[PDB]
Amino acid sequence: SFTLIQQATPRLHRSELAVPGSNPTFMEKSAASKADVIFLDLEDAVAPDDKEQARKNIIQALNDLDWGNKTMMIRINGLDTHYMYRDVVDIVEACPRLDMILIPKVGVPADVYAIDVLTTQIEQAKKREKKIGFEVLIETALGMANVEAIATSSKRLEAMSFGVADYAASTRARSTVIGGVNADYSVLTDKDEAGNRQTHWQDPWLFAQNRMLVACRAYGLRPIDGPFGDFSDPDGYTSAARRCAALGFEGKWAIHPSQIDLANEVFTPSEAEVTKARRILEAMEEAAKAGRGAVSLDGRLIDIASIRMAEALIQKADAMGGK
């Protein structure tokens, strides 16, 4: 294409740990974890009567605890709720350590614009060097119906998470569990020569995951898979993780500490894909040494979109090496 997209800021994002702001002990324990990204939650996991205190707890946690080089985020309240403006104002004013805001229930691009206006103004007032990035949750049918447009809604936007349980609720999917599969979401084969019919299970989230993936990959964002509720089923977690990784997802939520190592292992890039990326970068250097505008590797032209992907993958591999 003649149309070129710039990749978002290239962070390592294999594991995304959710931590309720209402639990300072859990926040403290999380600061020493192996998660790549942590969000401190003001939204779904925090009861209304606890939201004001959780906000205070999070300010203290972001300012006092040692988070290392983790990408630190908050999940703000919904735009449809009165809590949100104080989440953004109080925390962004008080907490230089904050890296990102996770905006829930995003439905249309203007939702993201709204948060960009507010965030920008606070950063202007505080004379901030760091600029906050955004992650959006696609966790409703409305957001899914507008996902491609949402993907281009802010220069801050870096990533989208698939909120599977809230998406199920929004679509009225038959789901009593967070994530997972369903014996009813299956095909019954036509009778074979023996008179037999098999039941082959299908993926209830295939459509959602692929559509969000395409939006992310078209427009330079990280595609992240959401929560998996069955803490007693690491095999099921790992299957779900490997399935979305196979599509191109870059990471997955952890909502129980056991899930952190599982996500980290699955979403580590292969040695081979890192090596290919490194060879692309050396082929770029070669083209510059030769005075040649076109980059070639193993007899193939490597185009600018492909160079940009290679640069992003290397930044991620390099982060792993220094963790």
The residues binding Mg ion (CB under 5 A) are: 44, 139, 166
Helix (H) or strand (E) holding 188: strand 186-188
Using rule CB under 5 A, residue 221 touches Cl ion: no
Give residues 223-262 in contact with Cl ion (rule: CB under 5 A).
226
Instruction: Based on the shown chain and the rule CB under 8 A, indicate whether residue 281 belongs to the binding site for a copy of itself.
Output: no
- Are the C-beta atoms of 156 and 134 separated by less than 8 Å? yes
* Closest to Mg ion by CB, 102 or 213: 102
Q: Which of 53, 47, 109, 43 is closest to 80 using CA atoms?
A: 43
Count, residues near Cl ion per rule CB under 5 A: 4
53 binds, among a copy of itself, Mg ion, Cl ion, none (CB under 5 to 8 A by kind): none
166 binds Cl ion (CB under 5 A): yes
**CA 186: distance to chain centroid?**
28
Q: Of residues 98-157, which lie at the interface with Cl ion (CB under 5 A)?
A: none
Is 44 marked as a binding-site residue? yes
CA 196 from centroid of its chain's CA atoms: 43
Closest Cα to residue 89, out of 76, 72, 99, 80?
76
Q: Which does 210 bind (CB under 5 to 8 A by kind): Mg ion, Cl ion, a copy of itself, none?
A: a copy of itself
Smallest distance, Å, CB 67 to a copy of itself?
Answer: 27
Judge whether 42 and 77 are in contact, CB under 8 Å. yes
Instruction: Identify whether the C-beta of residue 9 lies closer than 8 Å to the C-beta of residue 44.
Output: no
The DSSP result for 189-202, as a single string, is PPP-TTS---EEE-
Stretch that binds a copy of itself, among 28-36, 59-67, 141-149, 251-259 (CB under 8 A): 141-149
Here the tokens at position 20 are 């309720």
Does 292 bind a copy of itself (CB under 8 A)? Our answer is: yes
Minimum CB distance to a copy of itself smaller for 64 or for 273: 273
Q: Are 199 and 206 in contact (CB under 8 A)?
A: no
Do 151 and 219 meet the contact criterion of CB atoms below 8 Å apart? yes
125: partner contacted, choices Mg ion, a copy of itself, Cl ion, none (Cβ within 5-8 A by kind): a copy of itself
Q: Which is nearer to Cl ion, 116 or 166 (CB)?
A: 166
Secondary structure letter of residue 105 according to DSSP? S
User: Quick check: 158 binds a copy of itself (CB under 8 A)?
Assistant: no
Stretch 198-217 residues interacting with a copy of itself (CB under 8 A): 198-204, 206-208, 210-211, 213-217
Q: Which positions touch Cl ion (CB under 5 A)?
A: 163, 165-166, 226
